[PDB]
Every structure is written in structure tokens, then in C-alpha cells.
């Protein structure tokens, strides 16, 4: 219920940024391949804008699905 | 009076730009937390123009 | 006073701690119009009439 929006489109690192300034919730992302290491890679990357979602809510907690 | 329309008369702090707030939690103006029930300085936060 | 001939006290040249009034839980009713009780103690006026 209350879906204001719906959409359908260790070697990999997926990166995201979540920002909640004024109207609606901004999301940016990138993908890069990496070496099989527990730490983040030293080579530079930049994240590209995706969406500004109609959630309207502050957000304070989150999780990942395996 | 038409009582269907409401405005929030009380809140803990001012809304940020385009912040939106449905919450009906009792506003504590009083000395003591209100346990989710009305009382002296324990106000219901939405009021009608009527 | 009798209500057909009510008494007005003019209030001036003094500090109005309205919290002395609105925190008085002995009162059978408190209401306020144009101002929330927690905001009253910030305001200033030329005269007040009780």
C-alpha cells in the first residue's frame, strides 16, 4: 500500500549517495569493478544522479538484501 | 460550521521547506509527558476553522 | 464582579509571567487566541486589559 512511486529498469563495488534537502529525496550512484580486497579502492570515482523520489519523509534507518 | 478542514495549531518546532506532517501525537505544553491522552496543557495538535 | 457589570483591571509597566497563569493546573479552563501559551512570555504590549 501507499506506493507513491514504482519503477522497473566482491569483484563489483556499487556506490550510492542519499540526500534529503527541501522537496524530496535525491539519489546518486556509480559502479566500478575492484580487486578482491576487504577495503575500498584507491582509484577515484564520481557518482551520477538517478532520481528525486516522492517519499516526503525524513529517513533515519536502512538495510541491505542478500 | 464545516469541521472537515483542519490546521496544526501546535508543534515542537517549525517545518522545513516542503516538510509534511500527518502526526496526531498529543502536544506537551505541560510539565509532565501526556501518555497519549488529552489533559491540562496536553493538547490535541490539529484544530478546525469550523 | 457580576457579569452585567464586569470589572476590568488595566495592566501596564510590569512583567507579565503568563506561565504563572497557564501552568496553574487548579484552573477549570485555559484557552488563547492569536497566540500559543508558550509564545506569550516572549511578547511585548503597550497595554494589557484583564
UniProtKB/Swiss-Prot annotation, chain B:
According to the record, mutating residue 50 to S results in: In strain: Omicron/BA.1
Residue span of region Immunodominant HLA epitope recognized by the CD8+: 2-10
Q: Look up the domain of life of the source.
A: Viruses
Q: Where is this region: Receptor-binding motif?
A: 1-50
| Cystine crosslinks | 34-42
Q: Where is this region: Disordered?
A: 9-44
Record note on quaternary structure:
Binds to host ACE2. RBD also interacts with the N-linked glycan on 'Asn-90' of ACE2. Cleavage of S generates a polybasic C-terminal sequence on S1 that binds to host Neuropilin-1 (NRP1) and Neuropilin-2 (NRP2) receptors. Interacts with host integrin alpha-5/beta-1 (ITGA5:ITGB1) and with ACE2 in complex with integrin alpha-5/beta-1 (ITGA5:ITGB1). May interact via cytoplasmic c-terminus with M protein. May interact (via N-terminus) with host bilirubin and biliverdin, thereby preventing antibody binding to the SARS-CoV-2 spike NTD via an allosteric mechanism.
Protein's job: Attaches the virion to the cell membrane by interacting with host receptor, initiating the infection. The major receptor is host ACE2. When S2/S2' has been cleaved, binding to the receptor triggers direct fusion at the cell membrane. When S2/S2' has not been cleaved, binding to the receptor results in internalization of the virus by endocytosis using host TFRC and GRM2 and leading to fusion of the virion membrane with the host endosomal membrane. Alternatively, may use NRP1/NRP2 and integrin as entry receptors.
Its protein name is: Spike protein S1
> Origin organism of this chain?
Severe acute respiratory syndrome coronavirus 2
- Point out the gene that encodes the protein: S
Amino acid at each position: 500500500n501507499n506506493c507513491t512511486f514504482e519503477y522497473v529498469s566482491f569483484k563489483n563495488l556499487r556506490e550510492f549517495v542519499f540526500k534529503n534537502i527541501d522537496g524530496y529525496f535525491k539519489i546518486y550512484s556509480k559502479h566500478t569493478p575492484i580487486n578482491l580486497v576487504r577495503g575500498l579502492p584507491q582509484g577515484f570515482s564520481a557518482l551520477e544522479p538517478l532520481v528525486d523520489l516522492p517519499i516526503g519523509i525524513n529517513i533515519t534507518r536502512f538495510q541491505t538484501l542478500l | 460550521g464545516n469541521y472537515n478542514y483542519l490546521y496544526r495549531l501546535f508543534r515542537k518546532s517549525n517545518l522545513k521547506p516542503f516538510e509534511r506532517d500527518i502526526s496526531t501525537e498529543i502536544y506537551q505544553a505541560g510539565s509532565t509527558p501526556c501518555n497519549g491522552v488529552k489533559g491540562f496543557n496536553c493538547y490535541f495538535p490539529l484544530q478546525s476553522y469550523g | 464582579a457580576s457579569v452585567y457589570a464586569w470589572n476590568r483591571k488595566r495592566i501596564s509597566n510590569c512583567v507579565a509571567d503568563y506561565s504563572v497563569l497557564y501552568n496553574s493546573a487548579s484552573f477549570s479552563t485555559f484557552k488563547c487566541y492569536g497566540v500559543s501559551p508558550t509564545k506569550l512570555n516572549d511578547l511585548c504590549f503597550t497595554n494589557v486589559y484583564a
